Design a protein around this motif. Sequence first.
Motif, PDB file in Angstrom:
ATOM      1  N   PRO A 127       0.813  -1.222   0.000  1.00 29.88           N
ATOM      2  CA  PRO A 127       0.000   0.000   0.000  1.00 29.88           C
ATOM      3  C   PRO A 127       0.837   1.258   0.000  1.00 29.88           C
ATOM      4  N   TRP A 131       0.145   3.535  -3.056  1.00 29.43           N
ATOM      5  CA  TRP A 131      -0.244   4.918  -2.809  1.00 29.43           C
ATOM      6  C   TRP A 131       0.744   5.892  -3.435  1.00 29.43           C
ATOM      7  N   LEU A 146     -10.027   7.439  -8.302  1.00 31.81           N
ATOM      8  CA  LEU A 146     -11.441   7.078  -8.290  1.00 31.81           C
ATOM      9  C   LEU A 146     -12.065   7.171  -9.677  1.00 31.81           C
ATOM     10  N   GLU A 147     -11.771   8.238 -10.419  1.00 37.33           N
ATOM     11  CA  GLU A 147     -12.428   8.432 -11.704  1.00 37.33           C
ATOM     12  C   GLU A 147     -12.034   7.347 -12.694  1.00 37.33           C
ATOM     13  N   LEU A 150     -13.445   3.972 -11.589  1.00 41.24           N
ATOM     14  CA  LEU A 150     -14.874   3.788 -11.806  1.00 41.24           C
ATOM     15  C   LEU A 150     -15.201   3.661 -13.286  1.00 41.24           C
ATOM     16  N   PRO A 175     -16.638  -3.197  -1.090  1.00 37.53           N
ATOM     17  CA  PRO A 175     -17.905  -2.521  -0.767  1.00 37.53           C
ATOM     18  C   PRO A 175     -18.770  -2.196  -1.976  1.00 37.53           C
ATOM     19  N   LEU A 182     -24.710  -3.347 -10.539  1.00 33.58           N
ATOM     20  CA  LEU A 182     -26.008  -2.729 -10.794  1.00 33.58           C
ATOM     21  C   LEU A 182     -25.917  -1.669 -11.887  1.00 33.58           C
ATOM     22  N   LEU A 183     -24.846  -0.871 -11.881  1.00 33.02           N
ATOM     23  CA  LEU A 183     -24.694   0.166 -12.901  1.00 33.02           C
ATOM     24  C   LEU A 183     -24.569  -0.439 -14.295  1.00 33.02           C
TER      25      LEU A 183
ATOM     26  N   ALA B  66      -0.929   4.053   4.118  1.00 34.51           N
ATOM     27  CA  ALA B  66       0.051   3.004   3.913  1.00 34.51           C
ATOM     28  C   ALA B  66       0.348   2.314   5.226  1.00 34.51           C
ATOM     29  CB  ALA B  66       1.329   3.578   3.307  1.00 34.51           C
ATOM     30  N   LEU B 104     -19.331   8.975 -10.595  1.00 34.87           N
ATOM     31  CA  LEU B 104     -18.476   7.801 -10.450  1.00 34.87           C
ATOM     32  C   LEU B 104     -17.511   7.967  -9.282  1.00 34.87           C
ATOM     33  N   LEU B 105     -16.765   9.073  -9.270  1.00 28.90           N
ATOM     34  CA  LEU B 105     -15.894   9.360  -8.137  1.00 28.90           C
ATOM     35  C   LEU B 105     -16.701   9.578  -6.864  1.00 28.90           C
ATOM     36  N   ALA B 108     -17.428   6.160  -5.562  1.00 26.60           N
ATOM     37  CA  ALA B 108     -16.167   5.567  -5.128  1.00 26.60           C
ATOM     38  C   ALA B 108     -15.741   6.105  -3.767  1.00 26.60           C
ATOM     39  CB  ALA B 108     -15.079   5.823  -6.171  1.00 26.60           C
ATOM     40  N   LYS B 147     -29.961   2.928 -14.072  1.00 28.67           N
ATOM     41  CA  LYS B 147     -29.932   1.747 -13.216  1.00 28.67           C
ATOM     42  C   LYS B 147     -29.353   2.075 -11.848  1.00 28.67           C
ATOM     43  N   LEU B 148     -28.286   2.877 -11.813  1.00 34.15           N
ATOM     44  CA  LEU B 148     -27.691   3.262 -10.538  1.00 34.15           C
ATOM     45  C   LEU B 148     -28.667   4.074  -9.695  1.00 34.15           C
TER      46      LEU B 148
END
Lengths: 274, 191
Positions: A127, A131, A146-147, A150, A175, A182-183, B66, B104-105, B108, B147-148
Amino acid sequence: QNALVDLIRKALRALQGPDSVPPGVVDAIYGALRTLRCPAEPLGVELHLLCEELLEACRTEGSPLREERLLSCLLHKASRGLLSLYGHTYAEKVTEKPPRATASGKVSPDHLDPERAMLALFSNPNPAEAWKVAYFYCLSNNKHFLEQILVTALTLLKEEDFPNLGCLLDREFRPLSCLLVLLGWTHCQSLESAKRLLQTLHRTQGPGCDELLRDACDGLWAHLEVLEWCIQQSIPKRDLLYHLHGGDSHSVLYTLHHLPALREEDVLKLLQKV
Amino acid sequence: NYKTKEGWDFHSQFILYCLEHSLQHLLYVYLDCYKLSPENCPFLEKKELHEAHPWFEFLVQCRQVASNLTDPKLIFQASLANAQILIPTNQASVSSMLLEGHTLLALATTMYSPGGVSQVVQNEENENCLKKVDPQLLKMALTPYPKLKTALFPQCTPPSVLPSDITIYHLIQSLSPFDPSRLFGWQSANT
């Protein structure tokens, strides 16, 4: 300063193999490099080139150079900006050797998509290293974790790849596996693939997932069982997937009519299930 | 055997100047040389500097997670720091991308954060400012998420019946000539 930089550059680029370093790659290469004010501001390719040299050199060992001792004895007026340039080109070198698959040497990264490197980073056992890679990519490559994560998740969800999703989400994304499923669900056409996606992501998204998401996975499996019961009682894959993708509006009675002497018992059992 | 009147140190000043050099992974190497931690250094958590030097906050959260990224708490802190560094908003978080459409973010970041997704589905009274978003901007900006949207929040419809996509004449028509359209025009259910 450029010529002393080049003297260091020779001493290093020559140390880049297995040759034994004579006296100077341990004091005179250092002195010549200290004589190099290859400075900040818009400069030539040499500044970022030698910056990446010291840095991707700090990505190596065995002879006498790096960005590490470089930073140790190389804090001056004309060097912090070159250090930033080293940061940019060092993100470049660490992406250059991107997340190293020493075990998986068969995969060729000559024309590989970022998905492999990203998944290796996510499921990495470091990690700290993971990271560091993510932060460097954000800083000097403009990519939030994240972007991109996803976007790739929706992309994989449209195709219903179960076990790989269970594996990569096990890094951190247990999680939200059910949410990703689903999406992408409205973009699915095969019952086996859908069940696999729910099992290896949505069911894999267990207690760590939202209750609604796993509940949707369970209701979907129940509906799949009811539909298998009907199919046993009774095939247009077009009408089937039309009902399925449109089940939100497509009534179950709508789909069934769309599908006297038959097994009223089988349909009666399918209904009594509800 | 060194000190000052003011209170800084060549190592205090060393970390500060690495910030003046804007270092994250090199500063992380120095931090490991001091073997740094999520909060072992009380002087490295300047919220003003943390957002303002978003790179520094990213590095501090990197040390914290970390040390432990599996926890929803430390990982959520790291994700918030990453959003602050990437999204330039003074309040940059899942909401910053959400209201702008990049849900999306948003999802997340909200998977393992305060309040939670189902909580937001039900309760919007979480005083944690990071657990809320601009509603209409994200909502209309959540257009590519039918759907989401259906899965995340139950539809608060009244007790009236929802769409029934089969009609009595219609479902009857599965028996070929037994489509009840040929008669019974006074009954709408046999549509």
